[PDB]
Structure 1
């Protein structure tokens, strides 16, 4: 099945998921001089104070922190969005080396990792319906650079030993995702897709301009996870990122001058 290796990686995905060559695929390179400021874009509204985290899962491609999305608890509104989008899960993509790991790039620059806070449009009733709609999902993307530690990330880092291999999960209640946000909410936005199979073209991407900084030790602990299941040959979970895809007939808009 699909993955990130030489024989099942991003260049192979189109054989099972032909939309991989579609008209609104993600990620993309963000050319900062070509993005256009849109003064009609509204400020993002990130309302995470009532968030209810449940569990953390190694799914064989990344690790997901899952939330209770059966009521309006942690929601994203405003910006380019119409309506209310509920937080379902967050996860990361990261590299084997500090100079790679992000999916989006900025003037061709790669960051060490990228956080994806995944939300779905409540007008579609459930997440499975939302992925079938062109405005079904909103993913808030946040770049990570290596520098000082991010204190709000450490509780995630410290549970990773309990979910080393594919299929392992652990309780993960009372986690506050506000501790993963940078100071500024300035953003770029464009219509795109899921960056893993099934690659559905259902995402309004909102990518923050300001990265967060994490320590060497924090990212090193990401790199100790395994793609494989327990008792299978060990393959380190690193370089789980899709490279930039053609922009095609799309304009990236900026919320800031």
Structure 2
């Protein structure tokens, strides 16, 4: 019912999910000079185990790696979070050129891709779905990707894309440590927001890392080789699967650092 094409793209989502015009929608354009330095925030800690990954899937909207979230082994804690949130899955948003692809932008600048590590408040809610509807239910850590030098650990992931090039396909993806996709800095911007895809619920505490990671153009190209379409269909490459910046509506963006 929704996608990233000319007829079902982000500009039309509100026709189906009215909350798309809400007061805490994501993503947003981060004006670094207007972010509020908040030294009162606790250190952001991403405590990830190496073998919690389950599979890699092309769900028609992105490529997603799902995790075992039975306990609090792989969690994010600190920063603006009151407690630990368990990692459920990570996925990406990307474009067709280096000038576009990320959802969040910084001072008007977009990156070729953005990684989203999705976590939920399992201590408070029974299911991820239950959490995805509550204001304090989710915590998504966003990491910008820039193109430059090849990323060693990313190779395992980009090499796996061929087997999930078609929509609705999946493959086993064991022992991939999402910590390998994090930058050396834990500085970030945070603000109250929403899921960036339908149902667009305003249940996400966003934590956007300041430092991007880089992958090579070859690796980025592997993402663009994915398809929005199934095997027996006219091929349409999965690109520009991002939602543009939404109105801030008076929300305060906090920063764990001084610009």
TM-score (norm 2): 0.98
Per-residue deviation, residues 16-58 of structure 1 (Å, max 9, x unmatched): 1000000000000000000010110111011003551000110
Give the corresponding residue for 2:206.
Answer: 205
Helix, strand or coil: the match of 1:45? strand
Take 2:250 and 2:46, find their aligned partners in 1: how far apart are those partners? Answer: 29
Question: Which structure 1 segments of 5+ residues have no match?
Answer: none
Give the corresponding residue for 2:5.
Answer: 5
Give the corresponding residue for 1:145.
Answer: 146
How far does residue 249 in structure 1 lie from its aligned partner after superposition?
2.2
Take 2:202 and 2:17, find their aligned partners in 1: how far apart are those partners? Answer: 12
Contact 1:166–1:228 (Cα < 8 Å) also in 2? yes
Task: Compute the RMSD of aligned alpha carbons.
Answer: 0.8
1:67–1:112 CA distance, 2 compared to 1 (3 A): same
Contact 1:47–1:74 (Cα < 8 Å) also in 2? yes
Give the corresponding residue for 1:251.
Answer: 252
Take 1:42 and 1:54, find their aligned partners in 2: how far apart are those partners? Answer: 30
* 4+ residue segments displaced more than 4 Å: none
> How many equivalent residue pairs?
257
Helix, strand or coil: the match of 2:140? strand
Are 1:86 and 2:79 matched, yes or no? no
Take 1:43 and 1:13, find their aligned partners in 2: how far apart are those partners? Answer: 36
Give the corresponding residue for 1:219.
Answer: 220
Take 1:162 and 1:92, find their aligned partners in 2: how far apart are those partners? Answer: 17
Take 1:117 and 1:150, find their aligned partners in 2: how far apart are those partners? Answer: 18
How far does residue 173 in structure 1 lie from its aligned partner after superposition?
0.6
Are 1:60 and 2:89 matched, yes or no? no
Helix, strand or coil: the match of 2:153? helix
Question: Which structure 2 segments of 5+ residues have no match?
Answer: none
